[PDB]
Design a binder for this molecule. Structure first.
Ligand SMILES: [Hg+2]
Ligand code: NA
Ligand code: NA
Ligand code: NA
Length: 412
């Protein structure tokens, strides 16, 4: 049965009940609060532990399966959809902040290209490159943080090659096909522990708020993020779907309910990738070849909700700092917000870590993330649903336009 969905949903009810009662009936010290959420901490380690095999293997197997002739066209179609939606998300989010008003530019962009082509694959697996002007000469240093952007650019290129080599490379296709399935099943092992982790991730979140009035200060900013996420997922993404495929977008979104509802509870695109595969390929009867390529890449580079979030929050924090945001300066937020969402890993709190890239570029202190961290857990929950929904809709859109390529693939 679907006990996995019931168990994780029950964690939300128990997590909220536990967190509120614990927060009210006890006064946990800062150290005591940390130990309370330890079971949630372990789950995040388990989730972060699996994204590297998940991304590397799924990127290689998805691209490799596609034939050499049609791999480029399908890849081009997916990339155009990703940027088109992410840019529309950022534009929608930026228009909202200026309307609702809840409240080293080049070097940041170059560091993104310097990370698409890392100087070492092993180092890229756990370290990231950053450059800073100092005296002015640019000096770089490999700080910490998995380089998701670098690994994909390699896995995609590696996947394309081994697919083209043919029978000479069928062993690498077989090796990574099995390595992808082995990572699918390890994520299902994590699914069993997830209800325990969510019970404390949610409970721990609503215990560290301290003064409950910070939500009132963040109330309008809250609405701006949810309003943008609601507008994007309910209007824009369904609209783009209907325009291309000309089929009921809400029926397609209805099938992904397990993936969408799952994404909310756990708030991680990569962890729910196994759920997305089944829902798309089973409830919506989508081609396996398209799903196994569009989704894995989409789960990391295509994050429409996060891109809307980074732009909305960065501008919102700017209003708090009381610095004017005219036409000229808001552009770098749009470009950086799109870039930040590209590099963000498919894990919870990925938005918070990439906030430094957008916060620094616009000219804001790097510690302002603590101003909005109180509610980022609640916003994060919904961002993922939009992140998977955007990728989920991409599978249907890309499949429809790639109909000719798929037709000539069934006949080898
Ligand atoms: Hg939370
Ligand atoms: Na996108
Ligand atoms: Na995604
Ligand atoms: Na990302």
């Amino acid at each position: 049965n679907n006990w996995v969905l019931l168990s994780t949903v029950a964690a939300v009810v128990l997590g909220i009940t536990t967190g509120v009662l614990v927060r009210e009936h006890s006064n946990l010290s800062t150290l005591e609060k940390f130990y309370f959420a330890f079971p949630g901490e372990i789950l995040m380690r388990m989730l972060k532990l699996i994204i590297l095999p998940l991304i590397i293997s799924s990127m290689i197997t998805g691209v490799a399966a596609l034939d050499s002739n049609v791999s480029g066209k399908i890849g081009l179609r997916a990339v155009v959809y990703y940027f088109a939606t992410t840019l529309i998300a950022v534009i929608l989010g930026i228009v909202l902040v200026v309307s609702i008003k809840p409240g080293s530019t080049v070097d940041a962009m170059l560091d993104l290209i310097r990370n698409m082509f890392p100087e070492n694959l092993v180092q890229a697996a756990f370290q990231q490159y950053k450059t800073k002007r100092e005296e002015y000469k640019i000096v770089g240093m490999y700080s910490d943080g998995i380089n998701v952007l670098g690994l994909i650019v390699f896995a995609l290129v590696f996947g394309l090659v081994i697919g083209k080599m043919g029978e000479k490379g069928q062993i690498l296709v077989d090796f990574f096909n099995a390595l992808s399935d082995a990572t699918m099943k390890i994520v299902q092992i994590i699914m069993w522990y997830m209800p325990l982790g969510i019970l404390f991730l949610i409970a721990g979140c609503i215990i560290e708020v301290e003064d409950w009035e910070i939500f009132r200060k963040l109330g309008l900013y809250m609405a701006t993020v949810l309003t943008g996420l609601a507008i994007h997922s309910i209007v824009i993404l369904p609209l783009i779907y209907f325009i291309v495929v000309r089929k009921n977008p809400f029926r397609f979104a209805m099938g992904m309910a397990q993936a969408l509802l799952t994404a909310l509870m756990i708030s991680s695109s990569s962890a729910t990738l196994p759920v997305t595969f089944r829902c798309a390929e089973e409830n919506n009867q989508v081609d396996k070849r398209i799903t196994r390529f569009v989704l894995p890449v989409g789960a990391t580079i295509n994050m429409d909700g996060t891109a809307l979030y980074e732009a909305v929050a960065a501008v919102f924090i700017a209003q708090l700092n009381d610095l004017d945001l005219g036409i000229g300066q808001i552009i770098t937020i749009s470009i950086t917000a799109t870039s930040a969402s590209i590099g963000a890993a498919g894990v919870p709190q990925a938005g918070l870590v990439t906030m430094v890239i957008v916060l620094s570029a616009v000219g804001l202190p790097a510690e302002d993330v603590t101003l909005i961290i109180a509610v980022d857990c609640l916003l994060d929950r919904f961002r993922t649903m939009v992140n998977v929904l955007g990728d989920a809709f991409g599978t249907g859109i890309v499949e429809k336009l790639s109909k000719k390529e798929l037709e000539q693939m069934d006949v080898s």
